[model samples]
Target chain A: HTLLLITKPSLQATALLQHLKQSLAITGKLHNIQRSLEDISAGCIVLMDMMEADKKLIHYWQDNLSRKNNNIKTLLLNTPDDYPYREIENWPHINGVFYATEDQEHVVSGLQGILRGECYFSQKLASYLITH
Target chain B: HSSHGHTLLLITKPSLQATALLQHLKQSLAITGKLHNIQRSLEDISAGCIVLMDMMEADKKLIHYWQDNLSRKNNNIKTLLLNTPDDYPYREIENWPHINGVFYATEDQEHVVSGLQGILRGECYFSQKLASYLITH
Candidate 1:
């Protein structure tokens, strides 16, 4: 029932966080994965901003958080420059991807879908997965 | 304005993508919509309603059954198959009079949106690739 946003501080992140707070009423922050894993719990959705995150931290979250609770679903926040889906499919812990180009309504709906236990993918991404 | 009195009925297993697509279609086209399973009777659906059926959930037999029933009733309903496999029997299914479109699994949301709009305007919707395949064969 909670959202765990893992990303660096930025205007877009602030806007998204604010929008989610107002829309879904869920609480979270730009958490530091290196600090602690105490805040994460069952039924929590984690969105990692791939713009600043490296593989090591992603693996760290996968190894550490996944062990804490299998119910914790992780996602990638992608930009147009990153091709995260190519590597994202290999990681079972990562459930889906959210492109920055998508509208705020899509972001909120995608998060709501993830909260309801469904994997989220833009139609473009889903098509890519199916074809190749 | 073209979608007046038309309902976009989604026949797929419940999912986030499906819900989002329905919302987008309803909002964009200013039309009524419903999400239902294939088992639901189409008697209540009025003419000009577009049924976006998911092939992933309903098999060929089920599709045939529904299509056959619709034909018998002469309901004037439009049908479109969604999430079809790459090797879908496009030639065979294309022959169905009521089936106005076929959206492959590889198609993006933009393709689908355009296809829906085209179908609402009384035009057939097919991917350029699929259209080529149909023409060549």
Candidate 2:
């Protein structure tokens, strides 16, 4: 039941796109993401990259639809370094932040773990939040 | 001591005009590595040397992809001027804000590194070529 063959289009489905090529090789669960998100099977998993995206688009995902559904675990792929000043807090729905450059492997593994009922974030990010 | 030691790296199109300038910096900093090839890695930023590889010289797609990836990860990492004459492309780039500056890599080396470090440390590194365009337009 490895659902790594489904993915979204337009958002980052340009098979020619490098990031997509890289991530897809590791996780194949991307298929018509926008249309398929709400209907994912219970206990399904998602590794979504939302970088260079408009706030309104992400807002729709985290607003309320996902908040009510605990069946699917999510990993929000973010470019925190690009938009470092902005905060992604208040969105409890986003279980983790996967830095595109620094945390590729971790993001992939974390998403797999969440599917198995585990959660995680980098110890570096965690330490910063804890100490500062 | 912080200002005493420096390393200068140039990634140019083997320009002869740049020889004079590279010679000047050779006396100042420890000459560690001079690479004509361009690839992004931690070694790309090993020293205080201002790396001067024309962005155009690099595989365009690879460079652009790295620009997006690195700038997003570490803002401290500096992307110096691309020598338009050598191989720096100004218009084709998808993201403009990421390109820090453009300059003739062969024309100078020590000055360029200083300019970059200046901008990084809140100091003035803006040259007339850089300032005039940024201000007038």
Candidate 3:
């Protein structure tokens, strides 16, 4: 499955792309949500940075993709600490969350878990979910 | 002012810092403070007591078990979490209705004292930074 990264252009993003390329051994592209969604196909994983996206944009993508039966798994990156867990729960299509403080190892493992059709969350968030 | 007969029970691992904090709270607020390890049973703790749990020392499972048991046994007791990391999942933690406050690790003794006092006065205590973050994000 191809990986599409939707985030603002930054040095960190570039480094992350390089790391994913070398480690995951998969082809990936830095995509802009402003562009047409025609290229996003089934069996693709979209990692969208929450810092660069709004709720409306996420809803737009989810709705349009669902209409086409694209079967794409979407994950959120750089989610702030206060981001409501209920909002994440409401979006059942969201496969995972990579908090802003998430380490590289967890990020890679989270991607792998999502690839296996399992939901992934940081240990802290998972604990919160279980306890609450 | 007196703590209105409310006791502050600290549930944490033994440490110099914990000891110092308890002493400070006792001296400043004139509140009855008790220190206990995570394994200690809360059978003797009465109502109107505040349980300050150290998140660093206890896992979520233990905290959940303790809170569940405490709520069933003493519904009037309040709970607060301290030593939380900067990126702690606050929104999820807030879902626990009995948890009356949260204290981040970055907060100093002054802020903590103020928060504890506020909680004692029947206010939900969250740091200004945390409150702003929650409101906007």
Instruction: List each candidate's DockQ score.
Output: 0.04, 0.01, 0.01
Candidate 3 chain A weakest ten by summed lDDT = A8-17
lDDT per residue as tens, model 1, A1-132: 777777543223444554576678787665754555675676677777665557787677656765777777878765434565677665546667876444558778888887677778777777777677
**With candidate 1 superimposed using the best TM-score fit, by how many Å does residue B17's alpha carbon deviate from the native?**
3.7
- Summed backbone clashes in each candidate are 0, 14, 0
Steric clash pairs (candidate 1): none
lDDT of 3 by residue, A24-45 (tens): 7778877766565665677778
- Which docking band does candidate 3 fall into? incorrect
List CA RMSD, all candidates: 14.7, 16.0, 16.6
Model 2: per-residue Cα lDDT over A4-84, one tens digit each: 222233211222122333543443445443442445565444444554245765565666436655665555554454444
- B40-121 per-residue lDDT for model 3 (tens digits): 6656876667888777666778767676776675547777887765576767566454777787643365677788888777
Candidate 1 CAPRI level? incorrect
TM per candidate: 0.51, 0.36, 0.45
lDDT of 3: 0.67
Residue A99 alpha-carbon offset, candidate 3, angstroms: 41
Put down candidate 2 lDDT per residue, B87-118, tens digits, no spaces.
33334432433345555543244445555555
